[model samples]
Target chain A: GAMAAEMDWDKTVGAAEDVRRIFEHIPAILVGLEGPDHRFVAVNAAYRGFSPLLDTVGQPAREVYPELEGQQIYEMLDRVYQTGEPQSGSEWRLQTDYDGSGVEERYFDFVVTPRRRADGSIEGVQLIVDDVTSRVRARQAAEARVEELSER
Target chain B: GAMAAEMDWDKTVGAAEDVRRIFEHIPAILVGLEGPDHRFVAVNAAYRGFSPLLDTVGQPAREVYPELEGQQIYEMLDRVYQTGEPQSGSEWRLQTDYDGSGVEERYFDFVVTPRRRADGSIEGVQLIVDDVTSRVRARQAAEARVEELSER
Candidate 1:
């Protein structure tokens, strides 16, 4: 038979994909997170397009992106997994090799939503990342663009 | 290995598997999803039957569900990828040919969860779908039965 009787499944599996889609539309970097593997479950066009060559699916934190090897992020995820509480992190820095010649420093904001099971145990973690790099760059670009216009 | 110490696996995977088992009982669509590929890394028994029949998983959702394909559900998924927001939705009209004559009217609850990377980028999304067809029919039948009983 078909099934439909839920108290709080909205928070259970992931979140509604449509709602997540709203955030995905943002031009900044965005990511979906799960608790156990500390892996990226989803990334928006902004971020996925950020690295066209990298395969970031179903990989552990340590292997796929090794830069986070000893970071406290794992502890934060474990805490959320232990307790079904949502977590938000301040701006953190990620170094990317976007230009090929060297490295670039990027800062991003993120949140962690705990995934739960039917019995209300923490099942996994969901991480939402906002790549504010464009906004950051935009501010400076706006200034430069205006300056160029002024000079013109 | 010490008796109790050896038993301390933190019991995480078993818990997750139990939650996964519960997914089967609901007679709805439940899925474990990750990334742009849109494959079901873990699909419940019901979805396993329905997805292949419908050819939903490991395939772009737009192609599998044509009407929704226009909405660009995967693109919405990309938004969650960037935002790391867990989302749930209700009263969404699903276009299905369950009825021989035309598309069936099936209301469902759809949810997507984004797993995160250590830095809080979304790694992937988990989808949970609950079908409400049987429950609705059962209630209707019971109402008819009650009227017959009252007449008796």
Candidate 2:
């Protein structure tokens, strides 16, 4: 009986807040936007916790990710803003002081998709990233081992 | 000048519906839920359009994907419902007549995350899937090419 009422609450208040709660706890990095200006409208724990930038809710991405100025990310976000089209970047290297340390090379696969309005206009962008630096390094190590075996 | 004002829809409707509007058109499959019974409360175009399962809304997952019965998916969903923990599966295959054709294998990488109420109780699950059939095939082809080259 009590469980039924709780599940009913899930149906009523479920769409909006439920999605945020789900995303908030996700292990991936997620950042959202407000306009073609590339504002940092929202950042999940993984993004906010690991990023060197603090208080990300209101700053433009260029300010937060200064290292990404010439890295095609802003260009890609702008393209999504203008065209309302989504893009995926594979194994993109982002060299930055993400943890407030010196510049470190990290590989990430990410998708930038436009958020649209009910009138079918682009409102913002949702960026989802999967950090694959460790996997990439492991693969390289495996390849090196195979090469060594072949040389012998 | 006027164009800037119109693109401010992100600021105007900047809430739950705004988030849904953004995820509505993402290229990957996105689905929402209502309860641990695994009801299909919401399904975006990417999930409903390309999927073989028709008439997903208001139906339980077991009914929509009878083929997925005994798969880890239901058990995993139950785990998220019970424990509010998220899980991911890679290169998972679903054998089905997706386009009403004969049974075929479609590979996917997906995540199952629990949606929670404001009170922190588990509400439902949000499922995200990236169709990796093409990537999987490409990797297989690349390995065959390497084998051919090594034999020579």
Candidate 3:
């Protein structure tokens, strides 16, 4: 019925609004890349805060973070998008100078997952990242202290 | 002018679709609640996998997770909604019997942030949860082993 179709459409719009609200508020960084070029289609508040560019939507990943040109990160994203396979990394180091104040190092745990259409055709990829620099540095310091104690 | 307005609308709709796509593919569990009763408004694939109920949209949180009645989870959600203050929990333990079997124990890291209107009026809340049961159990086992070695 026309009424039932309208109801379904309303529900879908509502759900999309709700999803966007949650995406913006989530504590971790989230980025959505679309098409083979991996253009930025969606980003959350945390991603914006962590991004080098003030505006990222509609920009290619390589253009947004030019420093990542030689890095394996872009290659990994390409693989996931091409093969429809998910990838993850824990406590990986990344160095960049988004502020132009020299390079700074950080650690992150991240997941890259492919997005597909209803017929299982891959269309894009999603990136989720958690900053773990503090945790990694703390562990490193603890390990150094343990070595010192052993030397004593 | 009308063309510009239409372009903006199209962009908004495209961004919404992109956001929904990322929300569904993200590795973490996400749930969006609406209204004072905290009804499930939107949930992603990860959330559905973790949830006990097959279908949860439009159902109040209490009805969805009756076991959370006295666990302070509902109270916390209420406080976030009423006061518009965000809340978080780390390595919190939860035991539940979603299946017909006995209760199973798990640990999680979670964040609950209030959703708001354009005028800053509180509307609902967003919940993001990461299961860390394996990490917690591994640390516990390591500590237990250390204790046994010290005793020996």
Candidate 4:
């Protein structure tokens, strides 16, 4: 029945479009990496704003973030891709030229999760990150003031 | 020409699948509502966990959260849908039987954004929410302790 099959395909396309809309608008940063090379397969609005380069899709992570060399992020991603295990980090400090101006210190909490096919084979990885630089700096400032008061 | 068309369709399908996987795994609660009736068109994994009812898709918002009748969330959603303006709320208190035990107070930050079509017409709304009850309660407890110390 060609008619019935077409209707089912329409439903699938509709559902996928709905998911795409939600994915694009969410506030958190989300990126999808494909294959062992970890090329960017998907990037959301929030993540696009965070990246220094405009065109990130189809580019490998190392190329997009040459500054992230030896930051442990790559190792974590590799572990997740190889072992199919999820990795999470909180309040990790990073130095990057987010704007092309100069390198600046920032803090983040991130999760790297393996993306698997329906048949249970790992295909790629997903990255979810939240910038916590402001919050961390505020707490550090408060602690310094308390120490100063105690010394007086 | 036919082969070229097939290749493009395949690319679209693959990109959609990638977005769907990221949508399901992201930590934030996300839901997509369609039309003026505000029926659920999409619900991600985090949203499904937060909802008391299991089957929410295609159900109207009012029906899904009967307890939210007077919460002003419905009004906000209506304004966004009608005007194409986005709405955001932070640390708002909500009382609901999230676990079917009883109505309990919880704090949340949420955003409702208009979903527009390719022609720039509004079609639906997207909701992103984060639960911050634990952080709110901890701050309240610290304030109570400060007041007690001052009185002593």
Return the top candidate by lDDT.
3
lDDT tens digits by residue: candidate 2, B1-152 = 35443223233223555445444444556677668788876555567577755552567877766676656668878998899878888999877566666668889998778776757888788777888999999999999999999999
Instruction: Judge candidate 3 at residue B131 and give its lDDT.
Output: 84
Name the runs in model 1 displaced over 4 angstroms: A1-4, A7-30, A96-103, A137-152, B1-152
- What C-alpha lDDT do the candidate models reach, one value each? 0.54, 0.70, 0.76, 0.75
After superposition on all CA atoms, what RMSD does each candidate show versus the true structure? 17.4, 9.0, 5.1, 6.6
lDDT of 3 by residue, A1-152 (tens): 35433224224323776678778877678778888889888777777677545353787877756776666878988899999889999988877665556677878898889998868889899877888989999999999999999999
Candidate 2 Cα misplacement greater than 4 A, ranges: A1-14, A25-27, A49-56, A118-121, A148-152, B1-14, B52-56, B83-86, B97-103, B115-121, B141-152
Docking class of 2: incorrect
- The residue-by-residue lDDT of candidate 1 on B25-45, one tens digit each, is 223355555667554444444
lDDT of 4 by residue, A1-152 (tens): 35443223213223876778767766567777888878888777777677646363677887766677768777778888899888888899988677666778889988788877768888888877888899999999999999999999
Model 3 chain B is weakest, by summed lDDT over 10 consecutive residues, at B5-14
Q: Give lDDT tens digits, candidate 1, residues A29-144.
A: 43444556765555444565665433534455545545544456667777876776777765676764543444566667776666656687765665435556778788889999
Task: List DockQ, one per candidate, in order.
Answer: 0.02, 0.14, 0.40, 0.29
Query: Could you arrange the candidates by lDDT from highest to lowest?
Result: 3, 4, 2, 1
lDDT score of residue A86 within candidate 2: 82
lDDT of 3 by residue, B1-152 (tens): 35433224224323776677678777777778888999888777777676546353787878756777767778889999999888899998877654436567778899888888868888899877898889999999999999999999
What lDDT score goes with residue A76 in model 1? 71
